[PDB]
Amino acid sequence: HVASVEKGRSYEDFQKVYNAIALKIAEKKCGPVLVRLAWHTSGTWDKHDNTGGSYGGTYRFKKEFNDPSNAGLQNGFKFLEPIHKEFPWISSGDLFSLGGVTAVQEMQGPKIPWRCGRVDTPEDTTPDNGRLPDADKDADYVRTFFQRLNMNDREVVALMGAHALGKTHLKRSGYEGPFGAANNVFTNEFYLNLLNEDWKLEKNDANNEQWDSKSGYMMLPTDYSLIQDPKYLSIVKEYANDQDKFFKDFSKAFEKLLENGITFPKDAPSPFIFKTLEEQGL
Ligand code: HEM
């Protein structure tokens, strides 16, 4: 899949799209669902045959937006609709991925370089449901799962830190509760809370197991597996003790996730680094 720049567009065009998304996030407090949308639209990728991935923007098709794994992301899509209406020239893959970048940055997360040029592909290119991960599994599951995305242990642990941004909803996923204290702010608190809170393995009202802290947080079985495996645990401790290292590693892993499957020509533009609304005085 060769990246092809939307005709005649440059950094300033994409900064205008960024800003419109950023204003929407401030308006609706929809940062977390847009991060999740960027991840799910990218996370269908299979390194073995280059199916799925962010390039084709196939979430716009029924099979994918109706994936049970994507329950709730329709809200994010809906919030992007006015942006795509104002900027109809941007491809769907570019919009979904840029939505995630914008959301991380606007929630005071790291800068995430972003490259344009994803191109819409037809409905028959939509990947089947079942490529996104299960939450009821263990560290071995997680490690194996993420090999299909070409992610190693450090990349996995870093990416999972995005959980502290938001919450689980029983009706959507079968899990209920906030993942952290810092709702709508990107921090390293996922790691700190895993190490420092008092966690109990309980059943929620959907009869699924989750880990609950007295402070009112929860963790999925796959989240908690990062302190049950000794290789993951050492990285959890590293990020709990170095906010900057976490931010830099997250940025790299998230850009990689959003770019898997895409061939950027040698004369493609460099990755863009968008200014936040705060940085622009907006
Ligand atoms: C083993 C991997 C992971 C699994 C099993 C998992 C599963 C889940 C589940 C079940 C939810 C709750 C959905 C809901 O009820 O609304 C969720 C929420 C979330 N996921 Fe993950 N996730 C994984 C990895 C990731 C990664 C890699 C990212 C992005 C870097 C991410 C970002 C988020 C965000 C931001 C939310 C919060 C959504 C909200 O607040 O509405 N997840 N995840």
CATH number at residue 197: 1.10.420.10
Write 143-148 long-range contacts (CB < 8 A, 24+): 143/229, 148/45, 148/46, 148/47, 148/48
> Do 16 and 79 fall within a single domain?
yes
> Do 262 and 127 fall within a single domain?
yes
Whether 42 and 92 have beta carbons less than 8 Å apart is answered as: no
In 107-211, which residue ranges form alpha helices assigned H by DSSP? 139-147, 153-160, 170-173, 189-196
State CA 261 to chain mean position distance. Answer: 16
Report the candidate in 125, 89, 126, 87 with the shortest Cα–Cα distance to residue 4: 89
Mutation choice for ligand 1 from 28, 30, 97, 163, CB with most ligand atoms inside 8 A = 163
> Do 258 and 128 fall within a single domain?
yes
Q: Which numbered atom of ligand 1 lies nearest the CA of 171?
A: 15
> Do 58 and 153 fall within a single domain?
no
Nearest CA to ligand 1 atom 37: 166
Whether 17 and 101 have beta carbons less than 8 Å apart is answered as: no
> Do 111 and 152 fall within a single domain?
no
- Residue 124 sits at the vertex; the CA angle it makes with 37 and 64, to the nearest 5 degrees, is 25
> Do 240 and 270 fall within a single domain?
no
Mutation choice for ligand 1 from 37, 142, 147, 168, CB with most ligand atoms inside 8 A = 168
> Do 144 and 73 fall within a single domain?
no
> Do 140 and 238 fall within a single domain?
yes
> Do 8 and 122 fall within a single domain?
yes
Those residues whose C-beta lies under 8 Å from the C-beta of residue 228, and which sit 6 or more positions away, are 138, 139
Number of helices (H), then strands (E), belonging to the chain: the values are 13, 5
72 lines ligand 1 (CB under 6 A): yes
User: Which residues form the domain of 92?
Assistant: 1-132+254-282
- What CA–CA distance (Å, rounded) separates 178 from 185? 13
Cα dist from 49 to 144, 147, 188, 225, 260, whole Å = 17, 14, 34, 29, 12
| Domain count of the fold of the chain | 2
168 lines ligand 1 (CB under 6 A): yes
According to DSSP, the residues that pair with 91 across neighbouring strands are: none
- What CA–CA distance (Å, rounded) separates 27 from 18? 14
- What CA–CA distance (Å, rounded) separates 181 from 193? 9
Whether 257 and 39 have beta carbons less than 8 Å apart is answered as: yes
> Do 155 and 224 fall within a single domain?
yes
> Do 122 and 138 fall within a single domain?
no
Q: 11: domain CATH number?
A: 1.10.520.10
Experimental method for this entry?
Answer: X-ray
Residue 68 is encoded by which pair of tokens? 């049970």
> Do 96 and 147 fall within a single domain?
no
